[PDB]
């Protein structure tokens, strides 16, 4: 896991404004979530061939579809896999008012076929420590909501939560992590999309997009579900199902 | 319904900043929603003795409690009714990502005892027209989230949705209504709290608090679930249960 067959290319432009186009296929765990009508509404991250992790406030149901292997949501001609969702597992500690514990697992009806462009991100272990100021990457089609249609990427630093609440106050909970406010927006990530940091040569899912600066401010950090606080729940779910 | 036994008093100060203290008991449909621990997290509005309407993004469950007849959440000595919730009815069209159709009904285990300070707000009929620029009232303990602890009130004008999206863009959906941005904040309403307009001498529930200006800006309108778009669902629910 965590080692794309097509290695990402991150320039300086990923560190300012709205980041930059990703190399096609270079974030192979990134998926698009499309409802019954084909409309792309969230992101998520493959963690093996049968499971996708995303955000609970996305409100995914089984009528929605996981789209894997995509790069250009405007293209008509890239080998992608539309995968049916058999069952949705919303983390029952999800607080829809605070959006704390904002994680949901999708179990696929049929397995995804991993390939150069489709494979798993590594999950952190519960105890991993992704220090404040670590450069990390969010990717997604988030700027679609208004405009590019190819996958974007942005490098942005993590914040400690003590430091993140100077921006969001008491909204920032324990199972949350923030990143950005360093002159680069975080709106390129979709709701439910990944925030990955490169530990031990392998990209690890550190956050799931929860909410962002209302104005896509380059001086306001984005807020993510802290994956370390929820990977035990992720594993127990996979173990029981 | 809609005719408080203790009539509200609204001065000019309700039209600027964060409004003003309400007359005790003067908004008798206002309730407080407290979780298993006694913590006040949402508002709602009694619509008869057995039912409370609130917002779905509140994520009320049956371990929560409806608190009626309150004014001073810091007081220890006002006749209030803590009422158990027998069953929660979330409007199934609730889109947790857009927060469109943001309505949920609570059915009480035992009936509330109506009184001078506890009684029903009127519901609008599906076809009612609450014109843009109508002065309306939001009430709640919303400024509790940081500070007063007695019920606040604010008079603020309605907006057409065409006009509301100049502030919130495509976020503003069809089953939503906005109000404010006239030099008075909307943060005094709790999530799930009421927005009432006085039609035919009777206060009518026109909105349920959905979300507000991140900064409690006096020039940004609040966003409400448009009750007219959802009262048919309200009535059919009550009819079947």
Swiss-Prot record, chains A, B:
It catalyses: Preferential cleavage: Tyr-|-Xaa, Trp-|-Xaa, Phe-|-Xaa, Leu-|-Xaa. InterPro entries: Peptidase_S1_PA (IPR009003), Peptidase_S1_PA_chymotrypsin (IPR043504), Peptidase_S1A (IPR001314), Trypsin_dom (IPR001254), TRYPSIN_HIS (IPR018114), TRYPSIN_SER (IPR033116). The keyword Hydrolase applies. Residues 14-15 form a propeptide. Disulfide bonds join 1-122, 42-58, 136-197, 164-178, 187-216. Signal peptide: none annotated. This is Chymotrypsinogen A. It comes from Bos taurus (Bovine).
């Amino acid at each position: 896991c965590g080692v794309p067959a097509i290695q990402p290319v991150l320039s300086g432009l990923s560190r300012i404004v709205n980041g930059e186009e990703a190399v096609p296929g270079s974030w192979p765990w990134q998926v698009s979530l499309q409802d019954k009508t084909g409309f792309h509404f969230c992101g998520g991250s493959l963690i093996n061939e049968n499971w996708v992790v995303t955000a609970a406030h996305c409100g995914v149901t089984t009528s929605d579809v996981v789209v894997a292997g995509e790069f250009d949501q405007g293209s008509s001609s890239e080998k992608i896999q539309k995968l049916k969702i058999a069952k949705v597992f919303k983390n029952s500690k999800y607080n829809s008012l605070t959006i704390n514990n904002d994680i949901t697992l999708l179990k696929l009806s049929t397995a995804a076929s991993f390939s150069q462009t489709v494979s798993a991100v590594c999950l952190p272990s519960a105890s991993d420590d992704f220090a404040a100021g670590t450069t990390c990457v969010t990717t997604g089609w988030g700027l679609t909501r208004y405009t590019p249609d190819r996958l974007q990427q942005a490098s942005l630093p993590l914040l400690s939560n003590t430091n993140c609440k100077k921006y969001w106050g008491t909204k920032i909970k324990d199972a949350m992590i923030c990143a950005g406010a360093s002159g680069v927006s975080s709106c390129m990530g979709d709701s439910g999309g990944p925030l990955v940091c490169k530990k031990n040569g392998a990209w690890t899912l550190v956050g799931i997009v929860s909410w962002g600066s209302s104005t896509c401010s380059t001086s306001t950090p984005g807020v993510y579900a802290r994956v370390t606080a929820l990977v035990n729940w992720v594993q127990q779910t996979l173990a029981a199902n």
